[PDB]
Amino acid sequence: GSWLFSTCGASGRHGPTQTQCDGAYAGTSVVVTVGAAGQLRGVQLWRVPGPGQYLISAYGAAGGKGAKNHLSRAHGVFVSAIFSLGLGESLYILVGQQGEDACPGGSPESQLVCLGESAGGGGGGGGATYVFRVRAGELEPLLVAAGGGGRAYLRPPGSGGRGGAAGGGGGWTSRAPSPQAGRSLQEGAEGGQGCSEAWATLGWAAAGGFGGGGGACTAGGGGGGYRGGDASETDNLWADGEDGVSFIHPSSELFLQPLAVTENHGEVEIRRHGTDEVD
Ligand SMILES: [Tb+3]
Ligand SMILES: [Tb+3]
Ligand SMILES: [Tb+3]
Ligand SMILES: [Tb+3]
Any ranges marked Extracellular in the topology annotation, and which? Predict the structure, then answer.
């Protein structure tokens, strides 16, 4: 009795298609309906197979590396909690995608930065992983596992993160103030675009990951979350984006200490497990 959810092979600022998830889940226990457009595009709808308690373990996505800030990515957050789910219930699962790395570059000029032949150079914020339901016509969050902030170019309320040229992360209910800000869950949670100044300078810029990651500029993008991580408001050369803020519903039982462990894309595992168990 275990169900594993992934990005279905999708990466970048946009979530997976139905065909991608059908392929990824072929031969597995999982069937999902993927939103095709609007606020739920790329979100995976899973029918709960029966009533009872379930352990939901979610991993938000890592942030991207910066062109000269690459010794490690900011890892996404792991959050795990027990929920009572209903006969007939359906869960919406948005699996966060990694913030884009600055290297290799997506244009000749950005790649020259990556080869030392040089706004720009930052990594995008990672998307958060969201698990939620609809109750009485409203979205109800169950668990949000935050994404990691993107690295800056150089190494020395469900609100959105602050930012500017580098985008803050999207939150649960934030409004995006710019194209670089990560979209909120209510808005469909696409990653922010890289900043226009870097697109103009280098011909490409790293985007935030699906799940509310902010776009890079020189500073790194903020991670998605229940609250989005802040990014620099001045495109500072050394300012990594902040990770997002995670969430568990007040009625659930947090099972394990949250940890920053996700290496690349997010994931969710669900299994039958409850407070009837001692461990
Ligand atoms: Tb902050
Ligand atoms: Tb694994
Ligand atoms: Tb049992
Ligand atoms: Tb038993």
Answer: 1-273
Measure 272 CA to ligand 3 centroid, in angstroms. 8
Q: CA 92, CA 159: separation in Å to the nearest integer?
A: 20
Nearest ligand atom owner, CA of 242:
1
Å from CA of 86 to ligand 4 middle: 19
Q: Which residues surround ligand 3, an ion (CB under 5 A)?
A: 276
Q: Ligand nearest 53 Cα, by number?
A: 3
d(CA 173, CA 168): 14
Other CB atoms closer than 10 Å to residue 174's CB: what's the count?
25
Q: Token match 């020189």: residue?
A: 218
Residue written as token pair 């998605």? 224
- Beta-bridge partner residues of 33: 45
Q: Which residues pair with 81 in a beta bridge?
A: 56, 254
- What string of DSSP letters covers the chain? -EEEE--TT--SSS---HHHHHHHTTTSS---EEB-SGGGBTPEEEE--SSEEEEEEEEPPPPPPBTBB-S---PEEEEEEEEEE-TT-EEEEE---PPPPSSS-SSHHHHHHHTT-----PPPPPPPEEEEEEETTEEEEEEEEPPPPPPPSB----PPPP-SSSPPPP-SS---SSTTSPPPGGGT-PPPPPPHHHHHHHS--PPPPTTTPPPPSSSPPPPPSSBPPP--SS--TT-PPPP-B-EE-TTSEE-S--EEEE-SS-EEEEEE--TTS--
Closest CA to 274 of 38, 65, 61, 84: 84
The CA distance from 56 to 172, in Å, is 19
Ligand nearest the Cα atom of residue 277: 3
**Calpha distance 65→123 (Å, rounded):** 5
